[PDB]
Design a protein around this ligand. Sequence first.
Ligand SMILES: COc1cc([C@@H](C(=O)N2CCCC[C@H]2C(=O)OCc2cnn(C)c2C)C2CCCCC2)cc(OC)c1OC
Length: 122
Amino acid sequence: TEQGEDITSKKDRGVLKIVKRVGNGEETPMIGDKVYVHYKGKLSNGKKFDSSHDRNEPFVFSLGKGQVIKAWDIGVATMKKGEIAHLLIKPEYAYGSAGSLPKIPSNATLFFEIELLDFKGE
Ligand SMILES: COc1cc([C@@H](C(=O)N2CCCC[C@H]2C(=O)OCc2cnn(C)c2C)C2CCCCC2)cc(OC)c1OC
């Protein structure tokens, strides 16, 4: 099943979110904030897997700057500090028809688990 809230502006089911663990505090990050996450990512079919846990350091990026795939800019913006979410992502919000071989084939649907650790202003 493909479950989750459609968090796309276009409502095209391109990015589907489930909260797995409710966070602490009501605040979500703004565009431009520096965000710190742990994550696990895989193809929908489960044939390639990647995690921040492998390197035991957070993944850090500036939200809403296109430093990461569109689904992350959209998805992390909805998350609270301490929240764990699952995202199911159609290729249009990830790597598209071109893909990014060998990790990402053409037109791949992706899954992520993301933990929002913290965020701070620019
Ligand atoms: C397209 O290239 C890559 C994509 C990823 C993983 C990925 O798609 N990520 C990494 C975490 C942030 C979301 C998303 C992404 O935007 O990656 C492109 C990117 C932007 N900055 N950095 C350092 C990366 C790897 C992907 C997840 C599904 C299973 C295979 C890996 C990790 C990669 O290496 C860790 C990677 O190689 C550079």
